[PDB]
Amino acid sequence: GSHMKKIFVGGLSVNTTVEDVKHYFEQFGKVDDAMLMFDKTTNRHRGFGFVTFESEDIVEKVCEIHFHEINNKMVECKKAQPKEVMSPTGSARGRS
RNA sequence: GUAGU
Numbered sequence: 001g002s003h004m005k006k007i008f009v010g011g012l013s014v015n016t017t018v019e020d021v022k023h024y025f026e027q028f029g030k031v032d033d034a035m036l037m038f039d040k041t042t043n044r045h046r047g048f049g050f051v052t053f054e055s056e057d058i059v060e061k062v063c064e065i066h067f068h069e070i071n072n073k074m075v076e077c078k079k080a081q082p083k084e085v086m087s088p089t090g091s092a093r094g095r096s
Numbered sequence: 097g098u099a100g101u
Contacts, residue, residue: 010098037100047097076098086100093099 005032005056006080007063010048012036013073018049024070025051029058050080 009021022034036049053059059079068075085094
């Protein structure tokens, strides 16, 4: 459909872990899992990742806040787009 | 080191 039962999280500090994110988002409702975009060329993440949920009612609750705060830095939370947007027509953070 | 593994 139009969205996954998962959020995008962008602007993450280099100090912030996948477990920091997974334990943080649990304040709104139950978290299924989390992942950050790791690069083996440096062993750091690409400054963004994803968080999967128990319910899309939490995905909405979290996305309505839009700007969150982790390790004394701010992060942007958005609905995870359905991977078709990884095409060169949408990979520049685009929408249909 | 803000649009995927």
